[PDB]
Amino acid sequence: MDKVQYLTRSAIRRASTIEMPQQARQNLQNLFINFCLILIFLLLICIIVMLL
């Protein structure tokens, strides 16, 4: 790596934050529900496997 490091930095930062600063902020919300889903369900799936 040597050029793909700065080329990528400007590929998303100067494209996904200047053209969709209002949408990207709202879309990022999906990261919260996804983690919370996998974070709370990873425990429930164990209740049935540890009993049946």
The token pair that represents 45 in the structure block: 């799936």
Contact between 22 and 30 (Cβ < 8 Å): no
Contact between 16 and 24 (Cβ < 8 Å): yes
Residues comprising the chain, all counted: 52
Domains of the chain plus CATH, in order, are 1-52 (1.20.5.290)
The DSSP code sequence of 1-30 is: --SHHHHHHHHHHHHHTTSSHHHHHHHTHH
Experimental approach was NMR
Report the candidate in 7, 31, 11 with the shortest Cα–Cα distance to residue 19.
11
Contact between 7 and 1 (Cβ < 8 Å): no
Q: Rounded to an integer, what distance in angstroms lies between the CA atom of residue 12 and that of residue 10?
A: 6
